[PDB]
Amino acid sequence: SFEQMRQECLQRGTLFEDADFPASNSSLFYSPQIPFVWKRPGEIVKNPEFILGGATRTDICQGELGDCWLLAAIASLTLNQKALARVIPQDQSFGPGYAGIFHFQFWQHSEWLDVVIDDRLPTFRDRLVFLHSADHNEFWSALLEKAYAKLNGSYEALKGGSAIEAMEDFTGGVAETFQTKEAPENFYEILEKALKRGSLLGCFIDTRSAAESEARTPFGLIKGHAYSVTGIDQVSFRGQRIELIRIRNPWGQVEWNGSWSDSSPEWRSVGPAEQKRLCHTALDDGEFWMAFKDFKAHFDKVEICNLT
Ligand SMILES: [Ca+2]
Ligand SMILES: [Ca+2]
Numbered sequence: 001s002f003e004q005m006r007q008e009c010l011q012r013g014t015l016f017e018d019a020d021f022p023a024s025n026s027s028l029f030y031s032p033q034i035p036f037v038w039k040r041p042g043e044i045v046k047n048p049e050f051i052l053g054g055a056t057r058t059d060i061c062q063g064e065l066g067d068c069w070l071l072a073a074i075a076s077l078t079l080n081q082k083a084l085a086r087v088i089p090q091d092q093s094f095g096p097g098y099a100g101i102f103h104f105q106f107w108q109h110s111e112w113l114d115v116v117i118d119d120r121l122p123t124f125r126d127r128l129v130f131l132h133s134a135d136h137n138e139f140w141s142a143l144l145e146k147a148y149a150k151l152n153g154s155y156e157a158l159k160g161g162s163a164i165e166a167m168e169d170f171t172g173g174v175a176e177t178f179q180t181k182e183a184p185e186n187f188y189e190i191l192e193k194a195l196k197r198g199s200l201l202g203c204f205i206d207t208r209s210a211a212e213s214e215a216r217t218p219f220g221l222i223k224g225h226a227y228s229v230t231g232i233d234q235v236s237f238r239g240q241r242i243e244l245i246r247i248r249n250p251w252g253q254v255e256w257n258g259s260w261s262d263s264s265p266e267w268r269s270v271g272p273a274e275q276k277r278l279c280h281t282a283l284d285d286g287e288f289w290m291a292f293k294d295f296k297a298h299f300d301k302v303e304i305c306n307l308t
Pocket of ligand 1: 051052053054055056058059133135138
């Protein structure tokens with residue numbers, strides 16, 4: 001129990017050390033390093049605060065693990081302060097009662113799992129190397145990420161993750177899933193409404209075996225790799241109405257190289273405005289358009305995660 005471990009440590013005058021997820025290299029990687037040392041918040045700042053001026057979007061600043069798609073889920077959690085209070089119990093602080101131990105709750109399949117941690121964090125020049133607040137006295141987000149890394153087995157296990165999967169872990173909800181090649185007749189409008197509503201949308205290509213995991217296709221797509229759906233629209237192309245979809249690769253910047261890709265002749269073909277209407281520019285940002293018909297042929301699954 002968390003309350004019991006805190007009580008034990010407190011009555012013994014010591015700070016908690018998590019034997020299940022210790023302050024060592026195995027908790028960070030399965031291969032690696034850059035000069036870091038593990039420190040508790042009270043040893044890097046003088047008055048460490050757990051939650052400072054609210055738990056909000058300004059407290060979520062990427063560290064050396066990256067601008068993960070997982071960050072988008074934590075961002076959306078702060079917009080649901082009721083859900084945030086389930087993931088992050090408010091019985092906790094660096095004040096009287098502190099004993100170097102925190103806990104977080106993640107929905108797993110039919111249960112909220114309590115995940116317990118010690119507050120030792122990877123550190124550089126007395127400063128957090130991974131997730132951190134813009135307020136360097138504030139530690140909830142740093143600690144949330146450590147707890148999620150633990151559920152997942154390591155910090156390294158976090159890169160490449162789905163924001164959808166994390167949002168499921170954070171709320172107890174379930175994303176709806178659709179098969180692109182067996183999709184409803186109004187699939188376009190369904191996706192359009194979900195986007196307008198503020199839902200998280202993801203798309204994937206199925207692997208037929210472990211062999212296919214992170215396999216790149218000749219069209220510049222990657223199998224068993226999480227992507228995000230960010231736009232859907234229509235254009236006039238050579239006198240026809242073409243449905244388009246906008247996809248973001250959130251882990252690296254490999255892009256689609258077929259029709260409607262960044263440098264493709266479709267973009268040159270289409271009316272002068274319409275290129276600006278759809279806000280298109282050719283950049284190696286991991287983001288791109290495809291024809292919605294090519295989308296359905298090349299991707300296998302869509303996941304829609306409605307935020308209430
Ligand atoms: Ca804050
Ligand atoms: Ca691009």
